[PDB]
Ligand binder design. Structure first.
Ligand SMILES: O=C(O)C1CCCC1
Ligand SMILES: O=C(O)C1CCCC1
Lengths: 276, 279, 274, 279
């Protein structure tokens, strides 16, 4: 539905990523998106502007334009935003919070002081929506209609994986797929360094490592097999791969990724307990 | 709209790599499965049973593969290659392009073996990986002494149908083995561990596996489609004070980057050993 | 015709006065600095510089329009008690002390005269060679010309930009303490040069030149520091081998640890003040 | 500045170093971009597009660069140097000053190759770094057997226009490689990490990169302009009980200093290996 009007409160990386993805998917026209920022001097705002997205310094204007309204500002700004534009949330609005940690309860508490049944959806998505390969989960609020969940899923499915979850899973999702791309970019940078150390040109090492990661991830998604089984299938006895896997194990490679997911999840919980 | 009507492909070996390439080529539409033949000394393999269902011609005799094939993939373990080349060396004809996929095995050693039977064998050395099974492989190749200009181009067209493919100098292939050859196993290990992390924080295992794999897929795709440095893309994910930068700190504190450097180095060095102790 | 004063005549006051006068934005004789111990080395160097000196904080307040507070943070309250009754309409109070909040300064000064004009800044010692890194936050009653004047004064001795006050403790961890990280790194790099056979004097020069040149490349490039690192390291080469050993020691994480530890200690100290 | 009046400069190799030096030299006003020639086997590189846009003459034939040049910089990987010396060695004339920038490659090895062509090749070995592109390089050079006295003076004046430059005995050069040759990469790693630290504590990435870069620049300039020991300047920054000494403790607990010593040693040792891998 290109007839949908979409707003973003916040014109940062995620607003840009989602707007880019939605327009590339054909589901929205760029000029049917409006975004607001208190800082119009950002680079993301210039890219949004170049895309044809409407830009304004007035959050109220984004709200009035919008049918689906994404909250795409830092968690600690969300209560101030709700104070500011709570009076302007209408019954027709679906309010979609993308802020890490921020609970449906806290949003509904603010918005309920104005109209009684604000339709609220909480989502955790990630920057690969920009190439329509995002990972998105969402939870529906108290007054979100069944059609609202399905509309949400349809829209976010256009830019990658999307599924409904209970809200108590979202902080963990944040630690896994929300922060996940950054772990991968770190990994890809390091793998390229290892390629370069062993004699590959940087450009080729970056390409090969990224292609290797894309292909393996795709294999797993399209396989009913355990990742341990796919790992077994790669490594011939006495061979190069199993030697590399040993040195990963000796440094506690697996545990570092578990540490990461946990640290991001826990911090996400602190961002909310800091608020409440 | 690529298709090789004249080309008969054979695999010496019917294991994981031969399966992956034949599945990729057939899914790409570039080869009919019935125009592919694979040989193996063990017809009781699951990969062998899977190639059957695809329609691949199977035989226990490597000489049959060679007689049926124009493009000949050596998909056996490196230490088996010399015995293979001794076995079928007298069956190599002018028409054959021998594509070795064995890790570490040099063009020099293959040409020396085959040249004892017939001069000017056309040899191509290849490092590819298992994601060719989903047409997202990463493949490099190096052309031998007697490989014609059309030979490498033909191999690039074919291997491009199942993922990234480019020509390299042969002395890069051991390093590519360490990076993209072994790379999928690094990723499978990472995805298992990330799923463990998701489970620890309360996600169901199936969802954690799906989300972690989607995250890696999307990130890798972002980088392939971006002109930006992976550090710059990393910067765009992490909000100041946020969850991501906290998690990045704990990766750094464990030397995460150095473990991946360590791995590429270890695989490449083992690959060089596999050769150096062959010859 | 601007009069600048310094409460405290230690390392930071000398650094700023030296930078300001080397910059040509202030005459040394228009600068006054007060100290409870006129026998510090920093006092002699300010004297030799042409700065006016005194042991009366009240004389400095009376002398100047722009008043820098360059004492240790636990002294700021006792300085504000001592001179709060002498702050005039004309005064801009610029606190350089780590952690001390605009709120707490305005509260002490407001007991004597309403609407004190207060600026909080975080700078560092390289202002002495006019390559400092300075941020500042404007107080409740700072006029708009106060901040712009502040940025003009401090841009003459390095980078200067306005920040929200809640960023300043982090800046302290990064560019406030940063020169000490860099001096530690330079000492160690020189040790590495000496171990590999270089004379100490040459190793210190080359290591310092390397860090300066790389810093300037980054400041002047639109590119990411990762991308500039890629450009240094040829495949299989010496640099990528050295980067591996830094990575195996968690080099990056130690620098993150440092910025965090300094920021957290800055927050800790202010909460002890509260 | 009579050295540079009508002096022509050539680059064998058009990679990062050739661009940085060419950009540095032009920005200093010592050479017009049109008086600089560069050769590269692959003109498909980015630096070759950047250089071409500078008004710099490119060519794929190193013999063209040799013919067009007085001072000839060898800016190719160390394993290529003896291959280049064989290619253009008969074209090296008495007028040429051959300035090798390849890490590890010894004056002796270059002179031995070129001495078979003409008896007294003028050879200078150089270790510089990428900040010559903003005229803040760190350069050392050693003069060869047949370099005339003006050659070393000419070399010093040229490289002084893009940063620090001093003559050294050649046996120090591998160590300088480990320190200031590789050093900017250490700084870029450090700056990326400091910026991550700033982001973790709530700073926007852009501001954190700028603040971290300015802190390093200011501290380096401070040390260069001070007669004081680095530890004394460190002491001046740290207030008792304060934030800086707390941060320095955590650096010390991770062996921060030993990592930098490790780095200089590792690069120096790798440089020595790249020399001995040649001869
Ligand atoms: O706080 C953060 O870093 C966002 C939540 C997951 C992705 C970014
Ligand atoms: O081998 C290398 O990496 C070159 C020598 C110093 C910087 C690059």
């Amino acid at each position: 539905f290109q007839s949908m009007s979409v707003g973003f409160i916040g014109a940062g990386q995620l607003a840009f990523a989602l707007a880019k993805g939605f327009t590339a998917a054909g589901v929205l026209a760029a000029h049917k998106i409006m975004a607001s920022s208190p800082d119009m001097d950002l680079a993301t705002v210039s890219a949004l502007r170049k895309m044809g997205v409407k830009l304004t310094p007035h959050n109220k204007e984004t709200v009035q334009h919008s049918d689906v309204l994404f909250l795409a500002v830092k968690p600690h700004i969300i209560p101030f935003i709700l104070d500011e534009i709570g009076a302007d949330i209408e019954d027709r609005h679906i309010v979609v919070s993308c802020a890490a940690g921020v609970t449906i309860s806290s949003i509904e508490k603010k918005l309920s002081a104005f109209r009684p049944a604000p339709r609220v959806i909480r989502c955790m998505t990630n920057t690969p929506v920009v190439v329509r390969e995002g990972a998105t989960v969402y939870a529906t609020g108290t007054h979100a209609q069944v059609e609202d969940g399905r509309l949400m899923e349809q829209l976010l499915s256009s830019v990658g994986f999307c599924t409904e979850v209970e809200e108590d899973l979202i902080d963990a999702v944040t630690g896994l797929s929300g922060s996940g791309p950054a772990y991968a970019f770190t990994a890809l940078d390091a793998l390229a360094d290892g390629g370069v150390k062993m004699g590959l040109p940087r450009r080729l090492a970056v390409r090969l490592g990224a292609q290797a990661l894309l292909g393996a991830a795709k294999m797993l998604l399209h396989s009913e097999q355990h990742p341990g089984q796919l790992k077994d299938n790669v490594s011939s006895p006495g061979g190069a791969t199993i030697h590399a896997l040993h040195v990963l194990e000796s440094g506690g490679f697996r545990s570092l990724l578990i540490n990461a997911v946990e640290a991001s999840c826990i911090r996400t919980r602190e961002l909310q307990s800091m608020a409440d």
